[PDB]
Design a protein around this ligand. Structure first.
Ligand SMILES: Nc1ccc(C(=O)O)c(C(=O)O)c1
Length: 438
């Protein structure tokens, strides 16, 4: 496979469903490279646990934690890291209210080169235990010889784009990592970076981030096909923001409009949203506690009941993960019979304006509250017109893309409800014998 898209290991499924999966200990193993330094971008950290995931011989190498915590949360994280003299911290500025540092990324500097890992898991035991999470593994990027002048750039512009994402933090510890990236050859990269950073973007900068970044890449690097209006959009996520009083406010007016872009020229496109039902969570490996990582509040949900008619159950027989609740986020463009896809995105971004951006100032400014990061797989970047959908995620041409859940998505039944994490469920017990009482 050329895609280097992986799922995390899930405890309790049969070995055939973990054979091609990766645990964090696999990613950090010496087999992946001889570690010199690393940066861990994330939201939530268990520092004691995190250091134990590095190989013993690498546990004193410098580690930078990139986070968004403030005030007492920030103090708690520093207290976690204080016992480890090799750990430094970078507080990402969040100068727009209600923003989050969501991005999940590892920068791994080795004696042999550099690796970038863009993934969906928090750095805590539970996120790697029994959840469906996604990982993109970069190639081992070699160092450019001292005195040699080459760009090290890929046809997808990944090197400049990753540097641009890091520059937006305006942080000295990340300028060090920018200088590291400058010194390496990233030309083999076949994915496009799609990032979000906090700000208000107008003019040229509008296309740099969020859903306008996606739109720009689809305009420039995908082509429209006949009957494109019949190719659905699929979005799949672990959290939902306030989207407005009806679908015209944001979901179908700018979000869907960006996602249905194909090619340069100028809607009844079906929109499928995949988000665990209450029954999905109850019967999951974790049981109701899985819902602690699906943070859709009743205050948000009761303002947008129109949204739930778009919702489809989580189902992942293809990867043996129907009972491993999703914390991965993915977006893609399948054909009308779901046998091909025009593109696939794995990202930190949930279904929210904070993550993707919302237009302001009479449509001239894109406002983003949060840091997000994902990678886009486009057929053109692999010399293809479309991707065939892989029939079984872990089965055996290699030009078929490993979609990790079942197609077509299945609409909620009349008795199903979206998982809402801060109301009780006491009708039926979960797989551990328990109810849910927030
Ligand atoms: N405050 C958060 C809300 C939602 C999520 C999610 O991704 O589901 C996260 C996260 O895991 O980073 C953090």
């Amino acid at each position: 496979n050329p895609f280097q898209f992986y799922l995390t290991r899930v405890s309790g499924v049969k070995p055939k469903y973990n054979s091609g999966a990766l645990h964090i200990k696999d990613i950090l193993s010496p087999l992946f490279g001889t570690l010199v330094s690393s940066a861990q971008f994330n939201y939530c950290f268990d520092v004691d646990w995190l250091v134990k995931q590095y190989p013993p011989e690498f546990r004193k190498k410098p580690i930078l934690l990139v986070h968004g915590d403030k005030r007492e949360a920030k103090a708690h994280l520093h207290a976690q890291a204080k016992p480890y003299e090799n750990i430094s911290l970078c507080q990402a500025k969040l100068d727009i209210a209600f923003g989050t540092h969501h991005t999940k990324m590892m920068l791994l500097l080795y004696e042999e080169g550099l690796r970038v890992v863009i993934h969906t898991s928090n750095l805590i035991h539970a996120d790697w235990h029994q959840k469906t999470q996604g990982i993109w593994l970069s190639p081992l990027y070699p160092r450019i010889a001292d005195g040699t002048h080459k760009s090290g750039e890929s046809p997808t512009h990944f090197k400049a784009d990753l540097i641009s994402y890091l520059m937006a933090y305006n942080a000295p510890s990340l300028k060090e990592w920018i200088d590291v990236i400058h010194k390496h050859d990233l030309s083999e990269t076949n994915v496009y970076l799609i990032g979000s950073t906090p700000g208000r973007f107008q003019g040229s900068q509008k296309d740099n981030w969020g859903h306008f970044r996606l739109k720009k890449l689809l305009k420039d690097h995908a082509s429209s096909m006949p009957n494109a209006e019949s190719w659905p959009v699929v979005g799949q996520f672990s959290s939902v923001g306030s989207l407005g009083a009806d679908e015209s406010k944001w979901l179908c007016s700018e979000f869907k409009e960006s996602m249905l872009t194909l090619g340069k020229e100028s809607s009844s496109v079906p929109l499928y949203l995949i988000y665990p039902s209450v029954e999905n969570v109850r019967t999951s490996l974790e049981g109701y506690p899985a819902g602690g990582s699906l943070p859709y509040s009743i205050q948000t949900a009761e303002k947008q009941n129109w949204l739930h008619s778009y919702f489809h159950k989580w189902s992942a027989e293809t990867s043996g993960r129907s009972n491993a609740m999703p914390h991965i986020k993915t977006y893609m463009r399948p054909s009308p019979d779901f046998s091909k896809i025009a593109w696939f995105l794995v990202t930190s971004a949930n279904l929210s304006k904070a993550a993707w951006g919302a237009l302001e100032k009479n449509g001239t400014q894109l406002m983003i509250r949060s840091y997000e990061l994902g990678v886009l797989f486009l057929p053109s970047a692999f010399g293809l017109d479309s991707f065939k959908v892989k029939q079984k995620f872990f089965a055996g041409p290699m030009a078929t893309f490993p979609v990790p859940y079942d197609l077509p998505p299945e609409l909620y039944g009349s008795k199903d409800r979206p998982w809402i994490w801060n109301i009780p469920y006491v009708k039926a017990p979960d797989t551990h014998g328990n109810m849910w009482v927030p």
